[PDB]
Amino acid sequence: SKTFIQVX
Amino acid sequence: KNVLYRR
């Protein structure tokens, strides 16, 4: 599972 | 669990 956590 | 970050 590819989780893309956006930071700003 | 592929935790990646996108700025």
Alpha-carbon span A1 to A8, nearest angstrom = 22
Alpha-carbon span B6 to A8, nearest angstrom = 8
Q: What is the largest CA-CA distance in chain A?
A: 22
Lookup: tokens for B6: 């996108």
Query: Minimal Cα distance from A2: which residue of B?
Result: B2
User: Secondary structure of chain B: what % helix, strand, coil (to 5)?
Assistant: 0, 70, 30
Whether B4 sits inside 8 A of A3 (CB atoms) is yes
Whether A7 sits inside 8 A of B4 (CB atoms) is no
How many helices (H) and strands (E) would you count in chain A? 0, 1
| H or E element, residue A6 | strand A2-6
Lookup: tokens for A3: 């989780």
For residue B7, what are the contacts with CB-CB under 8 A and spacing of at least 6?
A6, A7, A8
